[PDB]
């Protein structure tokens, strides 16, 4: 039985001999640690491919159950049921948490009362074998994603002594635990200096450069629209101005920004911090915080001495509000805005750009759990939406959410429809008055209503920190749009630990765009976005991105049937980049401003110039030759030429208007060097190379396009290798190969996925041969092929393995 | 080679097939805190036999480190060094606990501040292989003995891949972590309900209350937990004329607060001396304030009096409804009616005591015994197993009055403020010195006599005297067992010297009165069933001293049997039958049966009826009834006495296993008895042995029980043999579908040897060879006949009573003196395993 032969090998690698290259995914007995192979990754996998599961976890947090929440639903639609066992030891679990458990209709939950229940055991029963994860990780996003937790993944066959001891232990306290219902829930409810981090200090240095270069009008854009006020205060603290004025368009944000400034700064509360709202006129204060409405009305700005504040901060929705109130002549003018769909006002100087991915690493954003779901007709949609929003739930104690719809007629209708049977449901639109917008905003903030429904008022407006839930009921028009509406929920608040965004996916042509926004991947490779899309969650902090199975296919279909090289998309990207700088930009400005990777420009046009021409050989070669770095032998030696074998190889490769041309060479070579460092440092593992970028003398390069549905992986250490058809199984075709992997030459294995293209071939490392009975022949019909099982020297990573093996 | 074949069988059994047997001890284990198995056992176990350890454990507490402390000290003297990795993830990891980590001489403690350090990784590498314990247990006493935890013990080779990951991960952040030095430590700157035992007690008082007796006493060996038991009985019936009498003054206020907690009504008395409450019908006076100048004439002679051991006597004269008392004494008064006896084991189960960590250490080698060398050794030892709180508030019991004062002077000259306090001290100097410790003005009070002292706050109990008795030991252990705010537990340090009286230490702690030296030695090796947070530890050189004291002394002499009889007779007031020994927790009646033929020959020997015929009847009656093996035999005797029914019509009636009825009858069988019944002494002694049959059986046997000491004769009797043979069975003997095997295990040439927890080597008698007359029978019988029953004794144990460990059978290929490897059907328990394999 191969099942036993596979287990023996794997059991032999995990406990006896690590150098032996096994042929079994069962029980290599791996140690799960949160070092870019997060504990959440393998527990999702074991959940996906299991018939049943029973957990014996002592501590469940709601944010952690959210990470498993979409995987358990897809399991319920598959017919997979499970059990969970917990306790009320130390009063740690909350009723709201216990309520989310009851929503798992396919998960059976009982509550034990053994003293000091601290067990943390997850057990997955497969069809043939079983897997157990035992260790220190609770069911909480800290233990699951970001922590230093020790657990061990043990796979095993159904007759193991360890399994029996565990199952018989579970069934013991399961037989004497009490089940979970709402009736049980009712009984339970009755009974210092802030220092800049990596992103800010990086942002701070850019502002300093603008200051130290003698200018006075800068700008800061935040895609989400958040994370700015604290950045400003850090920057104000360095300059230490005599007087400082902080302009804002929204009054609620104003006071919050003031309190936020107080934290960064040690000065007296009364002396320096003054509000200048409708009801406050602290004009004598050293740090003044004012709405434009009050500064503009009745020339209130006129009573202030011009150029008396050394530092000003507007947020650039307040321009052209009061255009006339730009008259101050301060030492430094700084504006901050949510990124523009379309600054000219601030003399084309961008201090720093806040991107979603960067801000998540910096822990300046509220964590979020994105959830993509299936299926503007009110009746059917409303009831489906209610039951889907109910399942995934909200992060706080009460529901405070903004719903984004496709059109205004839908927004108002949906609100009244939702209003039936308890949903609060009030709609705002571009049509509605300022007073009405403010009133209903206060209503949501005051928890008077749960849902505010809009379509357009997401830009520098309705910025509310308290929102638990962001619902998307519209085709994602743009990445920027998609982010800004995510950004509406990303402000940290007391009521919410995280923010759940529930994204309904329908037959929209633009679903490729929604995985595009979530990653900072301007380079349009459909493989990069499919790889990030599927089980590549080891990058984030505590936030998770989950897709239901059917929704995942919907995005896949949309990304496949849509061209990303469209001439309309590249034209719009050029115009965006032009606005960023007010110039005809070089390819750099597509990088520094994160718009379009120049490798995407070349896929449609052989030159940037030719694209300019719609609205040669030197350009196409010089980019292509240098656009990737490739060890920098060319980068440094051709730099010397501009003004040991690998060196030689670089010379042979280069051999084998005009002033405008020199300038244009500069952008391409500069991109070359930047591209080099960011992607190739100074032959890098788990990277992508193309045959050109790469059996010879001391070279045996294998390039596979994995198509198992043929070469197939047997474990993380072995795969089956086919030669060409009609290969001799003897003499030159095989005896050269059977010698190479045996002795002398080393193999270089490259694996593509069948959807991918030429410039993209993963590199997995080196290999050899099993040397034992890796012989074969062909089918009766065809031309003699040879199959051999090779032994990888470096085992393949989890996330790489899971994406290649579907 | 041999290692791998053993290993693969263990991998196979753990991970592939639970039903095969295996050689070696490498099967993965599920560590849970069971009331039969605990994680600490296995952690200690892996510690003892390893070369080097390194723990990657997030949370460590003082109370857990004390358990590893004694073991880690032994490891230190063997040249074994370890590593410990810890982090202050949740911010508290108390600074003192970090001082205790510094004490660990053979442990490199490092400190990482990586985010959320939550791992619990215990790795033990022996020279041949490695062990890994991974799960949810922290280095805390609750994670290692109480809480329901989940750990997996994994044995592995040095080249296993799983250990590569764990070792390489540990090395990564060991280099990134900062070493635990004292400078860094100092640098740190940051900012009503009745127990289940009660039910037993107030049941006894209620039973006494049903009768006309108005006097009863409860015995507390430690002398604690007395307050909340009385007040619970005072609440049952409220005499509304209540008066509380004690000899200690600091206890008066404590006892008054406790009684005020159980009773909910208002406050409105105590007259501690120049005090003036004297009313409200709730008194809390002392004997001295009453005894001085006759102050009992203030109230009528005529309802809930309760006293003390040392509590003038003319003030005991006046009559009330329900007088009582509470003592810790080795009463004669109170109509000789003892209500309940609080013993150590029971009292620790109801959590009325305080947790304790005993530490048996070796006294210094080479005043008479208060030199510079013995002083500096006691210092470096009490420092090691340090105190459980934050300030040291301990007691020290030495052996002579002269030692107490001289040691106090020498101890205090080293910076450890100590004061002696012997019986020839004044009463006011005691109260000045006692309240000097309660206020933390000093750290120690050395004594010989006063075990006066009644301070709850005591951290340490140091013992520098031979254990005089079993009673004295527990009493001066009870000076810490009271609960207090300053302390989490009581560390107790007993200095084991050359004294011959060390054998009493396991006798006092276990509570096992059946003085069998195997039962005690078992309590030395592994007490994995001692529920609660508390632990008992012996240094290796100290544990052998207790073993020597057990071997070198006998527990049988006729003077001790007589002493116990006089002790029971003084607790009873009458002459004790055999049920009075057990009911008072005196020596098990088997201890009387070992030297004297029966209880009648004992009573006459130390000051009869139908002597010769009655004596033989009593000796057999002991055999049949006293062990309590096989209830039906005892019940059949009762039916014959009363039912007197018609042959096997009665015998059948019993069924509402008939072979078992028949051998009960055989045992009794194989006219004069009515004449023996006509005697009143014989009928009286019968009514005692029969009840002794019932009690022994019900408990020990009615609850062939596994992992029990069983006798050749006892097995033959249990299994309805005609023979009831004892001499007939040897190492191997086989009946019809039986073949029990009895082995005296003593590994250290070719002998019976345990190969794993389910597979040993059997050896036949006297080089009988090959496929002989009996071997082939044994092989065919295992294959097609007897279920092989097996019993294991230790080399030291003498009784024919061997531990039963299930059934076994000849492994097929094992047939290679006849030597064969057999497979047990139930793997032998860990405590039994450790004790049987020494």
Residue numbers in the entry:
A (entry chain B): 2 to 192, 219 to 347, 352 to 373, 380 to 412, 429 to 668, 680 to 707, 731 to 743, 774 to 799, ...
B (entry chain A): 2 to 192, 221 to 297, 301 to 334, 337 to 345, 353 to 371, 380 to 415, 427 to 511, 514 to 669, ...
Give the text the authors published on this PDB structure.
The Type IV REase SauUSI cleaves DNA only in the presence of the target sequence 5′-S5mCNGS-3′, where S = G or C and 5mC can be 5-methylcytosine or 5-hydroxymethylcytosine. We show that target recognition activates ATP hydrolysis by the helicase-like ATPase domain, which powers active directional movement (translocation) of SauUSI along the DNA.
To ascertain the architecture of SauUSI, we crystallized the apo-enzyme and determined the structure using X-ray crystallography at a resolution of 3.1 Å. The structure of the TRD revealed that it has the fold of an SRA (SET and RING associated) domain, a fold that specializes in recognition of 5-methylcytosine in DNA. In the apo-structure of SauUSI, the two ATPases from each monomer are spatially separate and do not interact with each other. We modelled a DNA into the target recognition domain and the SF2 helicase-like ATPase by structurally aligning two close homologs (TRD of SuvH6 and the SF2 helicase-like ATPase of LlaBIII) and noticed that the orientation of the TRD and the SF2 helicase-like ATPase was such that its DNA binding surface faced away from the expected path of the nuclease-bound DNA (as predicted by the position of sulfates).
